[PDB]
Amino acid sequence: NIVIAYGERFFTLDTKSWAKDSKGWYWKFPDVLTEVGYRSGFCVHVQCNASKFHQGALLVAVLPEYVLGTIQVGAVLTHPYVLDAGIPLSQLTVCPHQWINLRTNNCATIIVPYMNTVPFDCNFGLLVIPVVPLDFNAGATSEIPITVTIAPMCAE
Amino acid sequence: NIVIAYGERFFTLDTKSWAKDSKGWYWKFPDVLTEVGYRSGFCVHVQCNASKFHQGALLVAVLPEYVLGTIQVGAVLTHPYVLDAGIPLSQLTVCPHQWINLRTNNCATIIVPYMNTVPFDCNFGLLVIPVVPLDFNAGATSEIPITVTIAPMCAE
Amino acid sequence: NIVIAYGERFFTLDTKSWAKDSKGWYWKFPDVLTEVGYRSGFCVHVQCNASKFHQGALLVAVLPEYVLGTIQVGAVLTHPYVLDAGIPLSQLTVCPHQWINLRTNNCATIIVPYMNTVPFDCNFGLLVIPVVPLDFNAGATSEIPITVTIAPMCAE
Amino acid sequence: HSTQETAIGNFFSRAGLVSIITMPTDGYANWDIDLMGYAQLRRKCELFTYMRFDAEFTFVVAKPNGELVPQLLQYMYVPPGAPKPTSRDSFAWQTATNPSVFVKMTDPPAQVSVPFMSPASAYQWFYNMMGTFSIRTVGTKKSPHSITLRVYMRIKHVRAWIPRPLRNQPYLFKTNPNYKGNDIKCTSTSRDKITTL
Amino acid sequence: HSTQETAIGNFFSRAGLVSIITMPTDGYANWDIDLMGYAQLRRKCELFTYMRFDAEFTFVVAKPNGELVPQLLQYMYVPPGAPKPTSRDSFAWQTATNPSVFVKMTDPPAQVSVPFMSPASAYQWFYNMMGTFSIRTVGTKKSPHSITLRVYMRIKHVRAWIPRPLRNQPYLFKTNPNYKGNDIKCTSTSRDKITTL
Amino acid sequence: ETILEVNNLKTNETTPMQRLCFPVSVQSKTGELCAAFRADPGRDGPWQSTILGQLCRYYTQWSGSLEVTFMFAGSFMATGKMLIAYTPPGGSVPADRITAMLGTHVIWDFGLQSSVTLVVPWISNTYTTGIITIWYQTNYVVPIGAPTTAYIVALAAAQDNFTMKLCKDT
C-alpha cells in the first residue's frame, strides 16, 4: 500500500499515547532529526499497536508549508477542526494522505520527495488527527502507542 | 612575460631615483622623443637595478588619453591616490599593466599598438607609481635607479 | 628524499620556537589528533623556515613504544642526552630518522606504517632534538618556527 | 463539452479592481503592489502554494464626478530594491532606472505589463515584493483638480503547484492566516435532525 | 541565467531626463545638447574612452500645472556649424537646411532621432558638438500661456572602447575632470581596527 | 584583479596611500590574527575600492564565485608562513589558529612563492558573509641587514560564473 506524493538508517521517535480525549499531534520536518544521531528525501512510517477490541480511525497526512496561527516530541493541536491554521480537516485529503483504521490495518507509510522553489536550501509537516475517537470497555488498555519511524533518502 | 595591450633603434631616457618618499612619475607619449636623435607603435621597457636587501613594489601601467586636473625628464605626481585626475590608483589595473616587485623580477615591458579615432594624426601616458614604499637598513644605497627604454615599431 | 620505515586531509599542529637554549620536544602518537577535527598508517612532515644566516641541525626520529622515566603542544625534554628513558641520543639512528641541517634542506618526512603485536587495538613517538644548537648574530630573528604536518593513511 | 473553462489560465482571467487611490487638493501617492488587497483574489490564490505568473496593469483615471480635464500625469514604477519617493520634488522622480509612463486624462488608459520579479522559481504565500507604484502630477505648481483613479490587474501565464484546502474562516490580519478563538463557525449549514431530508 | 542584462546595449537604455526648459510670459530658448548635464550619465559615460552611438529625443510639453492648451509649437534642430537664432523673428527660423517639427500640446510628444554627427569615428570625452535645439512658439503675437517642457534622451547602438577607472570624487566644472585639493575623501569606509569583522 | 583597501583605519584618512597594504612584522607572535574582512562587493567596507564592487552598485542581485590574490612585497632573504582561512557563510569567526585550520584554508609560504590565490566557492544576495582571516602560522624571520617590516597587497576579481541582474540607478 505504498503511496507516493504527487506521482514522483531508520530513525525512531517517541511513542505518543492515543487517549480517549486526544486531539492530534504534528511534527515539523526536518526539525525532528536535528538533535538525534541541504536537499534530501523522506520515507516516514506511522504504525500503531492495538488489539481487536479497540475501535477508531486516524488520518496521517503531510502538509507542505504548514504555518500556524495565534488564537522531537511534537506539539498537541488545540482546535483540530480548523487545524490551528484556518483550513478544514475534511478537505485535508487533497494532500498525500493515508487512513489508519483500527479494524483492518495497523501501518501507514508515505514517500515524500523534495519540494521547494529553490533546489538547495522547514519544508513540510505531518499531521496525525484522530477523526474517529478511541472507544473500549472497562478493563482494557486505556492508551494505544503510536510510533513514528523516519527514513531519509538521497541526502545532498 | 610579454604583455600585449588588448590582445593585438632603442631610445634610453634618463634614470629616475626611487627615494624613500617618492610619489610617482609619468611620461607623455609621444612627446618624450621629440628632441632626441603620424602613425606608429611602441615597445617600452621599464627595468630597475636593486639588490636582494631592498623591498618594494612598483606599478607600471599605460593610460590612453590621460588628462590632468588643477588642484623627457617627466613630472612628479602630487597626489598619487587620485593620480591628479580623479581616478583611483586601486582601479588602474583595468589598463594594460605590469607589477615590478623587487622580490622576484626586475623587468617590465608593455607592447602598445596604435589607438585613436582617426588613423592618421598625445596619445597615451605611462605611470610608474610606488604602491609599496622602498625600505632598507642603514648603510645601504639610498637611491634605486629606474631606467625607461622605448622602442618604436612600424612608423608611418 | 622519502624515507620509509623498515622497508614497507593534512592536519597541522602548532609551531614550536627553536630558541638558543632549547632541549627538544616529543609528541605521542596517535594522541596528538584526538581533539582536533583502530588501525591506520601515518605520514608526518617536519619542516622549518630559517634564513641563510642561521646554523644548526635537528634530528627527527620516530620511536615505537617510547616509555619515559622518573627523575597537542608536546612536552619539553629535560635531559636530552639520555632522552629521559636511559637510551643515548647518539644511538637513535637505528630507528627510521632524518637530519634537518639548516645549511642545505629545510624539510623532513617519514612514512610510518602500522606496527603492533595485535592487528586491531600509544604506538610510537616523534622526537625532535637540537643536536647542534642554533647560532646567529645580533639583530637577526631569535626564534625559528618548526611546523609539524601529519597525514593519516588507510584508516580502519 | 470540453474541459477548457476549468483550466488554470481561465480561472485567473477577467481582471478586476485591486486598488483605489484618491488624491485630493500632498500631490503624490505610494501604492504597494499586493494581490491580497480584497476578500476576492485571496481565497482563490490560497488554493495553491506555489504560483508563477506575470502582471498586467491598467490605470483608469478620472475626476471624482465623471468628467475629464486636460492634465498630464506620470506613473513611475519602482523596482524591488529601489528607494521610494518621499516628496513631490524628490530626486527619485528623475531616476533613469525607474521606468515611468506619461499619459493624459483625455487618453485611453495605460497598459503596463510587469514580469516575474522574484529571485526564486515561484511565489510563496506561506513561509516576494513584486514592486511599488508612485503616481504624481507633473509640473512645479499645484494642479487645481482633484484626481482619483483605480487600478485593474490581470494575471497571465498561470502555473500552480501543491493544492491546499480552501479557507472557510474570515481573515483578521493580512500577514498571517489567523482566526478568532472565541468561536469556530461551521462550514456547513445545520438542520434539526439527521433524518429530515 | 544568461549574461544579457550586463550587455553594453542594455546598460545605456531606459531614457531619463537630460534637460528642463522653462519659458514664462523672450519667447525662444536655445538648449545645447550635452550628455554631462546631471550627475547621472556622466559617471556612467566616463567608464570608457571612445563611444559611438546615435540619439533619440522626446519633448514632453505641458503647462507649469498639469493642464494643456491648444498651442502650436516648433522644435528646430540646428546642425553643427550653423548659426543659432538670436531673436524670435530671426532669419534662422525659416532656414530650409535646419530641420524642424510642428506639434501641438494636445499631441503625443515628438520622437526625433539624431544620428552620429561626429567627423571622427567615435566620440571623445578626454582630450564633438552634436548639436543645439531651439524651441519657440509660432505666430507674430505673444502667446498668453506659460510653457515648460522636459527632454528625455535615449542612447541606441552603443559601442565602447578603452575602459577607464570610475570617478569617485565630486565634480566641480563640466569641461575638465577637476577635484578639490584641500581634502581627498576615501573611496572605502573606515573601521576602528583591522581585526574587527 | 584590482587592488582592495583592507587597511581602512581611522588614522589613514589623512594619508590615503597607506590603505592599499597591510603590514607584517617581527614582533608579532605566532598563532595570532593579522587581518579579517568581509566578502561582500555590494555593502560598504574593503570592497568599495575595487571595480567589482563599483559595478555591482548599478544592479541589485548578484551570484557567483570570486577569487582573492595576495602579493608579498618584502625582502628576498626573508621567509615565513601565513594561513589564509575562509569560513563558510552562516558560521562564526574562528578564535585561534586551530579551529581555522579545520575549515577551508591554504598554507602560503612566501619563501618559495610570492602570490597565493584563494577562490570563494559561492556568494549570493537576495547574513551571507564570507569572512577571510589572515593568521600567523610561523613568525617573520629576517637576517641582518634585511628590513623588519613588509607589506602585503591584496587583489580581488570575479570568476566566469558571476552574473548579475535587476539594474538600479544609484
mmCIF file with all atom_site columns, N, CA and C in Angstrom, chain E residues 127-157:
data_model
loop_
_atom_site.group_PDB
_atom_site.id
_atom_site.type_symbol
_atom_site.label_atom_id
_atom_site.label_alt_id
_atom_site.label_comp_id
_atom_site.label_asym_id
_atom_site.label_entity_id
_atom_site.label_seq_id
_atom_site.pdbx_PDB_ins_code
_atom_site.Cartn_x
_atom_site.Cartn_y
_atom_site.Cartn_z
_atom_site.occupancy
_atom_site.B_iso_or_equiv
_atom_site.pdbx_formal_charge
_atom_site.auth_seq_id
_atom_site.auth_comp_id
_atom_site.auth_asym_id
_atom_site.auth_atom_id
_atom_site.pdbx_PDB_model_num
ATOM 1  N N  . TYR E 1 127 ? 40.529 64.793 -23.925 1.00 0.00 ? 127 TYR E N  1
ATOM 2  C CA . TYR E 1 127 ? 41.413 65.273 -24.976 1.00 0.00 ? 127 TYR E CA 1
ATOM 3  C C  . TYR E 1 127 ? 42.700 65.789 -24.346 1.00 0.00 ? 127 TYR E C  1
ATOM 4  N N  . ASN E 1 128 ? 33.361 67.539 -30.260 1.00 0.00 ? 128 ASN E N  1
ATOM 5  C CA . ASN E 1 128 ? 32.292 66.660 -30.722 1.00 0.00 ? 128 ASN E CA 1
ATOM 6  C C  . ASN E 1 128 ? 31.117 67.467 -31.264 1.00 0.00 ? 128 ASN E C  1
ATOM 7  N N  . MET E 1 129 ? 30.451 68.233 -30.388 1.00 0.00 ? 129 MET E N  1
ATOM 8  C CA . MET E 1 129 ? 29.443 69.249 -30.725 1.00 0.00 ? 129 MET E CA 1
ATOM 9  C C  . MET E 1 129 ? 28.285 68.655 -31.537 1.00 0.00 ? 129 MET E C  1
ATOM 10 N N  . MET E 1 130 ? 27.510 67.794 -30.863 1.00 0.00 ? 130 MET E N  1
ATOM 11 C CA . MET E 1 130 ? 26.476 67.011 -31.542 1.00 0.00 ? 130 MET E CA 1
ATOM 12 C C  . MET E 1 130 ? 25.369 67.893 -32.118 1.00 0.00 ? 130 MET E C  1
ATOM 13 N N  . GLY E 1 131 ? 25.012 68.974 -31.433 1.00 0.00 ? 131 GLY E N  1
ATOM 14 C CA . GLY E 1 131 ? 24.061 69.915 -31.995 1.00 0.00 ? 131 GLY E CA 1
ATOM 15 C C  . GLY E 1 131 ? 23.432 70.767 -30.906 1.00 0.00 ? 131 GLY E C  1
ATOM 16 N N  . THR E 1 132 ? 22.566 71.684 -31.340 1.00 0.00 ? 132 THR E N  1
ATOM 17 C CA . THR E 1 132 ? 21.782 72.513 -30.427 1.00 0.00 ? 132 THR E CA 1
ATOM 18 C C  . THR E 1 132 ? 20.326 72.460 -30.865 1.00 0.00 ? 132 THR E C  1
ATOM 19 N N  . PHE E 1 133 ? 19.417 72.676 -29.920 1.00 0.00 ? 133 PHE E N  1
ATOM 20 C CA . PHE E 1 133 ? 17.989 72.749 -30.194 1.00 0.00 ? 133 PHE E CA 1
ATOM 21 C C  . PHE E 1 133 ? 17.478 74.158 -29.923 1.00 0.00 ? 133 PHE E C  1
ATOM 22 N N  . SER E 1 134 ? 16.431 74.543 -30.650 1.00 0.00 ? 134 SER E N  1
ATOM 23 C CA . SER E 1 134 ? 15.802 75.844 -30.480 1.00 0.00 ? 134 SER E CA 1
ATOM 24 C C  . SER E 1 134 ? 14.292 75.664 -30.478 1.00 0.00 ? 134 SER E C  1
ATOM 25 N N  . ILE E 1 135 ? 13.638 76.160 -29.431 1.00 0.00 ? 135 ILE E N  1
ATOM 26 C CA . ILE E 1 135 ? 12.213 75.948 -29.209 1.00 0.00 ? 135 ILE E CA 1
ATOM 27 C C  . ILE E 1 135 ? 11.527 77.304 -29.127 1.00 0.00 ? 135 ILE E C  1
ATOM 28 N N  . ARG E 1 136 ? 10.494 77.497 -29.945 1.00 0.00 ? 136 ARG E N  1
ATOM 29 C CA . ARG E 1 136 ? 9.726  78.733 -29.926 1.00 0.00 ? 136 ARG E CA 1
ATOM 30 C C  . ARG E 1 136 ? 8.283  78.433 -30.296 1.00 0.00 ? 136 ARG E C  1
ATOM 31 N N  . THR E 1 137 ? 7.408  79.393 -30.010 1.00 0.00 ? 137 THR E N  1
ATOM 32 C CA . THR E 1 137 ? 6.003  79.301 -30.379 1.00 0.00 ? 137 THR E CA 1
ATOM 33 C C  . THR E 1 137 ? 5.781  80.037 -31.694 1.00 0.00 ? 137 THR E C  1
ATOM 34 N N  . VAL E 1 138 ? 4.912  79.485 -32.541 1.00 0.00 ? 138 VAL E N  1
ATOM 35 C CA . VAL E 1 138 ? 4.665  80.081 -33.848 1.00 0.00 ? 138 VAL E CA 1
ATOM 36 C C  . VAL E 1 138 ? 3.764  81.302 -33.700 1.00 0.00 ? 138 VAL E C  1
ATOM 37 N N  . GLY E 1 139 ? 3.755  82.142 -34.731 1.00 0.00 ? 139 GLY E N  1
ATOM 38 C CA . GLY E 1 139 ? 2.923  83.329 -34.728 1.00 0.00 ? 139 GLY E CA 1
ATOM 39 C C  . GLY E 1 139 ? 3.708  84.609 -34.538 1.00 0.00 ? 139 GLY E C  1
ATOM 40 N N  . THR E 1 140 ? 3.073  85.747 -34.816 1.00 0.00 ? 140 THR E N  1
ATOM 41 C CA . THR E 1 140 ? 3.691  87.054 -34.651 1.00 0.00 ? 140 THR E CA 1
ATOM 42 C C  . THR E 1 140 ? 3.189  87.790 -33.417 1.00 0.00 ? 140 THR E C  1
ATOM 43 N N  . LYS E 1 141 ? 2.435  87.118 -32.554 1.00 0.00 ? 141 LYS E N  1
ATOM 44 C CA . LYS E 1 141 ? 1.919  87.719 -31.337 1.00 0.00 ? 141 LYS E CA 1
ATOM 45 C C  . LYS E 1 141 ? 2.332  86.874 -30.142 1.00 0.00 ? 141 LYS E C  1
ATOM 46 N N  . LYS E 1 142 ? 2.442  87.535 -28.992 1.00 0.00 ? 142 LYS E N  1
ATOM 47 C CA . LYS E 1 142 ? 2.879  86.878 -27.768 1.00 0.00 ? 142 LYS E CA 1
ATOM 48 C C  . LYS E 1 142 ? 1.772  85.976 -27.238 1.00 0.00 ? 142 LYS E C  1
ATOM 49 N N  . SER E 1 143 ? 2.071  84.687 -27.100 1.00 0.00 ? 143 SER E N  1
ATOM 50 C CA . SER E 1 143 ? 1.082  83.738 -26.608 1.00 0.00 ? 143 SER E CA 1
ATOM 51 C C  . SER E 1 143 ? 0.913  83.895 -25.097 1.00 0.00 ? 143 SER E C  1
ATOM 52 N N  . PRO E 1 144 ? -0.332 84.044 -24.610 1.00 0.00 ? 144 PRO E N  1
ATOM 53 C CA . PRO E 1 144 ? -0.583 84.261 -23.180 1.00 0.00 ? 144 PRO E CA 1
ATOM 54 C C  . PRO E 1 144 ? -0.655 82.970 -22.364 1.00 0.00 ? 144 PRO E C  1
ATOM 55 N N  . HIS E 1 145 ? 0.378  82.139 -22.483 1.00 0.00 ? 145 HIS E N  1
ATOM 56 C CA . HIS E 1 145 ? 0.427  80.863 -21.774 1.00 0.00 ? 145 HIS E CA 1
ATOM 57 C C  . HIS E 1 145 ? 1.880  80.573 -21.428 1.00 0.00 ? 145 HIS E C  1
ATOM 58 N N  . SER E 1 146 ? 2.151  80.318 -20.151 1.00 0.00 ? 146 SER E N  1
ATOM 59 C CA . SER E 1 146 ? 3.479  79.901 -19.730 1.00 0.00 ? 146 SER E CA 1
ATOM 60 C C  . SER E 1 146 ? 3.718  78.464 -20.175 1.00 0.00 ? 146 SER E C  1
ATOM 61 N N  . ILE E 1 147 ? 4.838  78.236 -20.858 1.00 0.00 ? 147 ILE E N  1
ATOM 62 C CA . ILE E 1 147 ? 5.156  76.940 -21.444 1.00 0.00 ? 147 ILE E CA 1
ATOM 63 C C  . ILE E 1 147 ? 6.405  76.390 -20.774 1.00 0.00 ? 147 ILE E C  1
ATOM 64 N N  . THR E 1 148 ? 6.349  75.124 -20.372 1.00 0.00 ? 148 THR E N  1
ATOM 65 C CA . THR E 1 148 ? 7.503  74.407 -19.852 1.00 0.00 ? 148 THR E CA 1
ATOM 66 C C  . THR E 1 148 ? 7.542  73.013 -20.458 1.00 0.00 ? 148 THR E C  1
ATOM 67 N N  . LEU E 1 149 ? 8.747  72.464 -20.599 1.00 0.00 ? 149 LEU E N  1
ATOM 68 C CA . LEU E 1 149 ? 8.909  71.145 -21.189 1.00 0.00 ? 149 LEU E CA 1
ATOM 69 C C  . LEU E 1 149 ? 10.203 70.516 -20.696 1.00 0.00 ? 149 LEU E C  1
ATOM 70 N N  . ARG E 1 150 ? 10.254 69.191 -20.796 1.00 0.00 ? 150 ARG E N  1
ATOM 71 C CA . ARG E 1 150 ? 11.422 68.413 -20.424 1.00 0.00 ? 150 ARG E CA 1
ATOM 72 C C  . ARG E 1 150 ? 11.790 67.485 -21.571 1.00 0.00 ? 150 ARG E C  1
ATOM 73 N N  . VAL E 1 151 ? 13.088 67.254 -21.734 1.00 0.00 ? 151 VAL E N  1
ATOM 74 C CA . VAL E 1 151 ? 13.618 66.467 -22.840 1.00 0.00 ? 151 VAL E CA 1
ATOM 75 C C  . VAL E 1 151 ? 14.186 65.173 -22.276 1.00 0.00 ? 151 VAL E C  1
ATOM 76 N N  . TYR E 1 152 ? 13.761 64.048 -22.843 1.00 0.00 ? 152 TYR E N  1
ATOM 77 C CA . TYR E 1 152 ? 14.282 62.736 -22.499 1.00 0.00 ? 152 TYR E CA 1
ATOM 78 C C  . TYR E 1 152 ? 15.114 62.208 -23.661 1.00 0.00 ? 152 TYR E C  1
ATOM 79 N N  . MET E 1 153 ? 16.235 61.565 -23.337 1.00 0.00 ? 153 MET E N  1
ATOM 80 C CA . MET E 1 153 ? 17.176 61.148 -24.375 1.00 0.00 ? 153 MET E CA 1
ATOM 81 C C  . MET E 1 153 ? 17.542 59.686 -24.192 1.00 0.00 ? 153 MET E C  1
ATOM 82 N N  . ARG E 1 154 ? 17.362 58.895 -25.245 1.00 0.00 ? 154 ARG E N  1
ATOM 83 C CA . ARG E 1 154 ? 17.803 57.510 -25.287 1.00 0.00 ? 154 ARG E CA 1
ATOM 84 C C  . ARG E 1 154 ? 19.098 57.393 -26.080 1.00 0.00 ? 154 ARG E C  1
ATOM 85 N N  . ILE E 1 155 ? 19.840 56.325 -25.802 1.00 0.00 ? 155 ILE E N  1
ATOM 86 C CA . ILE E 1 155 ? 21.107 56.045 -26.463 1.00 0.00 ? 155 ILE E CA 1
ATOM 87 C C  . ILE E 1 155 ? 21.012 54.653 -27.074 1.00 0.00 ? 155 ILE E C  1
ATOM 88 N N  . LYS E 1 156 ? 21.053 54.579 -28.402 1.00 0.00 ? 156 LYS E N  1
ATOM 89 C CA . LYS E 1 156 ? 20.912 53.324 -29.123 1.00 0.00 ? 156 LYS E CA 1
ATOM 90 C C  . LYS E 1 156 ? 22.203 52.994 -29.860 1.00 0.00 ? 156 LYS E C  1
ATOM 91 N N  . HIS E 1 157 ? 22.407 51.690 -30.087 1.00 0.00 ? 157 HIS E N  1
ATOM 92 C CA . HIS E 1 157 ? 23.560 51.122 -30.798 1.00 0.00 ? 157 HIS E CA 1
ATOM 93 C C  . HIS E 1 157 ? 24.883 51.538 -30.144 1.00 0.00 ? 157 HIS E C  1
#
